[PDB]
Design a protein around this ligand. Sequence first.
Ligand SMILES: NC(=O)c1ccc[n+]([C@@H]2O[C@H](COP(=O)([O-])OP(=O)(O)OC[C@H]3O[C@@H](n4cnc5c(N)ncnc54)[C@H](O)[C@@H]3O)[C@@H](O)[C@H]2O)c1
Ligand SMILES: NC(=O)c1ccc[n+]([C@@H]2O[C@H](COP(=O)([O-])OP(=O)(O)OC[C@H]3O[C@@H](n4cnc5c(N)ncnc54)[C@H](O)[C@@H]3O)[C@@H](O)[C@H]2O)c1
Ligand SMILES: [Zn+2]
Ligand SMILES: [Zn+2]
Lengths: 256, 244
Amino acid sequence: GSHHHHHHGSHMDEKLLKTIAESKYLVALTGAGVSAESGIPTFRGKDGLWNRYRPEELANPQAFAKDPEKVWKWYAWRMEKVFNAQPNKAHQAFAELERLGVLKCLITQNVDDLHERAGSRNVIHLHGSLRVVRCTSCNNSFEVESAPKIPPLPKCDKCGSLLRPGVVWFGEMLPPDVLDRAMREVERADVIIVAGTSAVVQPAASLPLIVKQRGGAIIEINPDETPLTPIADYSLRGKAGEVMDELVRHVRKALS
Amino acid sequence: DEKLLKTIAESKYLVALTGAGVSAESGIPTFRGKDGLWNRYRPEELANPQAFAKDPEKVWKWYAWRMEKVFNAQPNKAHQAFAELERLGVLKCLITQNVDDLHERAGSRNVIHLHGSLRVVRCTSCNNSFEVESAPKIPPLPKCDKCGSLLRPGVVWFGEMLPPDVLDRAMREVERADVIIVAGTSAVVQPAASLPLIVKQRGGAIIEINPDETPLTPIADYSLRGKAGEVMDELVRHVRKALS
Ligand SMILES: NC(=O)c1ccc[n+]([C@@H]2O[C@H](COP(=O)([O-])OP(=O)(O)OC[C@H]3O[C@@H](n4cnc5c(N)ncnc54)[C@H](O)[C@@H]3O)[C@@H](O)[C@H]2O)c1
Ligand SMILES: NC(=O)c1ccc[n+]([C@@H]2O[C@H](COP(=O)([O-])OP(=O)(O)OC[C@H]3O[C@@H](n4cnc5c(N)ncnc54)[C@H](O)[C@@H]3O)[C@@H](O)[C@H]2O)c1
Ligand SMILES: [Zn+2]
Ligand SMILES: [Zn+2]
């Protein structure tokens, strides 16, 4: 509260750089903001296509069950834009930090494939991916090179059923193995960069808490303050592209 | 022969069912009770989920060997002949028990794979599935990029259900055809051996192409004791001339 202020560093000072450079097991958690600079806007409450629905009204199993064509029209639109988008400076910076051996694992809530395309090897998709198309009925699953044309609904060539985007919607359990991996990674982390996320959607929002409780540091990068700020050792108000870019440069120099 | 040729040329909906024998002339021998590699087991003992579970390396080694041979083989005159028959609008659909890709590589468009394909590999844990261009080197067991788990050949082993939609489509083609060419199959393995019966029971004809007689022979309207390669090559030429 106003009588319970917790203060955090707000600059790229030497202590911050020292915390990242000297970390023994640094990980990252990214949200949609990390791709905003690649041409993929955060939804800010509107579906972005028809602009009459909150995203949650479409990224939902009930909604999909009720109107597969509408939900698929939305995802094919998202897919095409993501597939044609390019990794930004943030994506590249995360890949770089991993190349440098500092970043151990990147957990992302994003369903885009920009971290991979930037070169990040160790990525956990907490909420699935737009690259994956899977069956609603059997276990058939595969990756696509392009968005499907939705005049006809995509159907599984194994069981004939309706295929769906390989993402996790609200009301759906995350894949157990994926969740397990994410937990073990943060239970192992001494430092965590949390960039481009509103820090409200669970359980992703809680991952930084685990690092915190085990004595690790939290480094938040967001142009906005979030429910996580009060517990962040550092909260930097800026775009992930500019901030991560500056961050990796300095870490790069100091790491030599 | 003249009636044989006519039955084909005048068919309203001809389909085909092929087995290991239509790929023999491509350098991919039928197993004849042996694995063809160690020549120590029946193929049924390797293309088995229990065998895979018990010894993944041995089964993968067998499939890697099969893959390399398949990927480096060329479609033969039979595959080509079936592709042509489809181009002429005579062959409506080809159903194959083969896990090689020589039919579609020959150009065949409408092909149903009853038993999967060697081109397909999939994760036994996360189920991701994709196609490959080269066979794997088995010093290490093939593993999933997305989850690191053990991959397996995307074929259907004995004891596993056929993909339902695949079984469903093959049944609907046979319950629709008035003629079916059954080539290169010993007509013993089910349910593939039963597909021609459905065509017969609905009044259609069966044209068998096999250098051997099989359990299907007695119900075949025509049985051609020859290699699918030669036989089909001639057949398709006459069918093209007769329709010229
Ligand atoms: N985006 C939505 O509207 C939305 C709506 C419903 C459900 N969901 C689900 O919510 C989950 C979590 O979403 P989220 O937190 O990642 O997205 P979000 O839209 O909730 O938040 C994006 C965050 O990034 C910040 N941001 C904007 N531009 C930035 C930039 N250039 N650099 C850094 N940060 C920037 C924003 O201030 C915000 O905190 C999603 O994975 C999705 O499954 C999303
Ligand atoms: N090949 C095996 O030993 C074997 C053993 C166990 C299980 N399986 C399964 O059995 C299924 C059915 O196998 P199948 O019937 O296709 O193979 P098959 O080995 O049982 O029979 C091949 C058939 O083709 C004939 N043939 C040989 N050369 C030929 C040629 N040039 N032209 C035409 N015919 C020729 C053979 O005389 C024989 O009837 C397979 O898809 C596999 O899943 C195979
Ligand atoms: Zn399915
Ligand atoms: Zn996998």
